[PDB]
Design a protein around this ligand. Structure first.
Ligand SMILES: O=C1NCCc2[nH]c(-c3ccnc(-c4cnc5ccccc5c4)c3)cc21
Length: 259
């Protein structure tokens, strides 16, 4: 009987339990994401502040429900406090030092696969509990530590929605796969997207498998109704047998330096 705990919205001042700094870890609709410190443990965390409305109350829900998945930024506590006489919801999540996915890169196929593979699990988890993330841009994929065995983790649930939408998550997955392999988006716009107008031009892509190209093409189908389901993405070999992919090298770092 493996029951994880429910969600507890603490009412004590958050300042009773953490020291809040002004280092800013991220920007978003609701203002800044602040680095804060657990007093008892002197460990570091990210703080997100929402105005308490029912939208806020819906993020926190989904995220919290989503949190017990290893590839999704984990919520550690949630408070309701007053701020300038306004109810707010404070989310305290795990702090992810490694910074944004791509930035790390700018410093191998197979390495690419592993990433896609982990991002897959994030979606797979979400989809199986009926949550569509929507906003799976690469800004929202952060690493736990600069240490190069760090884990890639998805964040930012400002646009999460219940599905009791998913096909558009797989789009992002395809765009992110794209940019991982060549170094730029498939779109160099509003009109080229609706059409499904994009190349695998060379010598950037000349070395890349038709196995891989197919897959991307299936993720970037203009028509949602048969873009690939996450369940199939994860079953597809490139991702499925992750480590037996050829360690064939790619220019992605160079290009994202150049660009
Ligand atoms: O929900 C969000 N929306 C807006 C952007 C954002 N960043 C975060 C976030 C969450 C956890 N950690 C970070 C983070 C931690 N450490 C960093 C070090 C250096 C650069 C960026 C960092 C980001 C950011 C959450 C959100």
């Amino acid at each position: 009987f493996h029951v994880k705990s429910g969600l507890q919205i603490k009412k004590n001042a958050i300042i009773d339990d953490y020291k809040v700094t002004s280092q800013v870890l991220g920007l978003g609709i609701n203002g800044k994401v602040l680095q804060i410190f657990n007093k008892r443990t002197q460990e570091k965390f990210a703080l997100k502040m929402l105005q308490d409305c029912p939208k806020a109350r819906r993020e926190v829900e989904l995220h919290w429900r989503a949190s017990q998945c290893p590839h999704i930024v984990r919520i550690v506590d949630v408070y309701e406090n007053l701020y300038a006489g306004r109810k707010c919801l404070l989310i305290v999540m795990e702090c992810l030092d490694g910074g944004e996915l791509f930035s790390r890169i700018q410093d191998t196929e197979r390495e690419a696969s592993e990433i896609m593979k982990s991002i897959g699990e994030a979606i797979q988890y979400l989809h199986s509990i009926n949550i569509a993330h929507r906003d799976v841009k690469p800004e929202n994929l952060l690493y736990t530590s600069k240490r190069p065995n760090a884990i890639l983790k998805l964040t930012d649930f400002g646009f999460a929605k219940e599905t009791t939408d998913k096909s558009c998550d797989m789009w992002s997955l395809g765009v992110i796969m794209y940019i991982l392999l060549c170094g730029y988006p498939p779109f160099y716009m509003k009109t080229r997207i609706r059409m499904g107008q994009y190349e695998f031009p060379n010598p950037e892509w000349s070395e890349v498998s038709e196995e891989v190209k197919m897959l991307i093409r299936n993720l970037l189908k203009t028509e949602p109704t048969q873009r690939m389901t996450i369940t199939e993405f994860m079953n597809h070999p490139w991702i499925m047998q992750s480590t037996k992919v050829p360690q064939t090298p790619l220019h992605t770092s160079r290009v994202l330096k150049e660009d």
